[PDB]
């Protein structure tokens, strides 16, 4: 399975993942491609903020589903 | 000039609060008291696995926009 991650600019990030991969793992794979450390990442699926301790299968995320990425650049 | 934060209990219920990063943990407990009826002295708040201390601010603990705190009750 590949997942898709949408940025604010409109750029799509394509990731290689397994259902057993946690959100922490998913974020860590985003770091590899954009250079954004996981603490500054906030991931959304269909309106829900994703929790770092949960798997892709916990949220029932399947192949080619789109996630949204909002970055923590300013602390306000 | 506040941000949204979430407080989760074991029971599953989530509470939406409006708090300043410069607010104390004492203030948040007070806000939880207003919305739920839960006295502050019986409240225990947890962020990123650690217990939050009353005199400290959300900014002390790096509590951010849409961050989630957990509520554990005392008995």
């Amino acid at each position, epitope marked *: 399975m590949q997942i898709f991650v949408k940025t604010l600019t409109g750029k799509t990030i394509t990731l290689e993942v397994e259902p057993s991969d946690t959100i922490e793992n998913v974020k860590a794979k985003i770091q590899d491609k954009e*250079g954004i*450390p996981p603490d500054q990442q906030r991931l959304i699926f269909a309106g829900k903020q994703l929790e770092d301790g949960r798997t892709l299968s916990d949220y029932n995320i399947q192949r080619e589903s789109t996630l949204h990425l909002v970055l923590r650049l300013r602390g306000g | *000039s506040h941000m949204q934060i979430f407080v989760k209990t074991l029971t599953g219920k989530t509470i939406t609060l409006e708090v300043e*990063p*410069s607010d104390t943990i004492e203030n948040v407990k007070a806000k939880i008291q207003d919305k739920e009826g839960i006295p502050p002295d019986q409240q225990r708040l947890i962020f990123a696995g650690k217990q939050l201390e009353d005199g400290r601010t959300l900014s002390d603990y790096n509590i951010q926009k849409e961050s989630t705190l957990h509520l554990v009750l005392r008995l």
Partner: antibody
Amino acid sequence: EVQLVESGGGLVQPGGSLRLSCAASGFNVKTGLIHWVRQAPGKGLEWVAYISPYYGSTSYADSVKGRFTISADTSKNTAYLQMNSLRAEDTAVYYCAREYYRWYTAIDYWGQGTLVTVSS
Amino acid sequence: TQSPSSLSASVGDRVTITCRASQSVSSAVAWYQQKPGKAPKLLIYSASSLYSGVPSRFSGSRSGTDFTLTISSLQPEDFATYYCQQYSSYSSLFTFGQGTKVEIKR
């Protein structure tokens, strides 16, 4: 160890232009924002501009808006300040500095600054 | 824009500088310390929290629309110039206040 080193300071004539560089190490410029702040001899700090190198987002002080342009080069890990229609009041020590989400808007690492002097 | 204002105190004194720079601003207010010929250092962020490695004699408070920097007991290395920084959410402008220079009284 995060370090920011400004450079490109010096002399220009009123109406002229200069380009300042802010090179960062131990830290990726795109993981936060980058600021220029200046300080004329014997006077206070004046905020100049910031940029968010990840998005291209910029913001400038009024005293500087139409004649200064802040930029970035992520590959070089550097931020630039293109100053134009420069005038005597612009004579100052220009610092770059970064803001990192954890400090809620505050600027946490500053370079030692570079002297820009605008005069005929 | 202007020369710093001046305050004289002795080692051991309490000092509370109050921030002027702007109007409704925010609550994200930072305070910096600067010594002559050197670059500014961050002390307090978002009004009341201490930046990494700042001595506990420094504290920051908000009341109404006024922000205060307090040094509870002046040490020799605290004699310097202080600045508050304000940030307008709306206009995305940062503003540094006048600058208070705490000098040694004798």
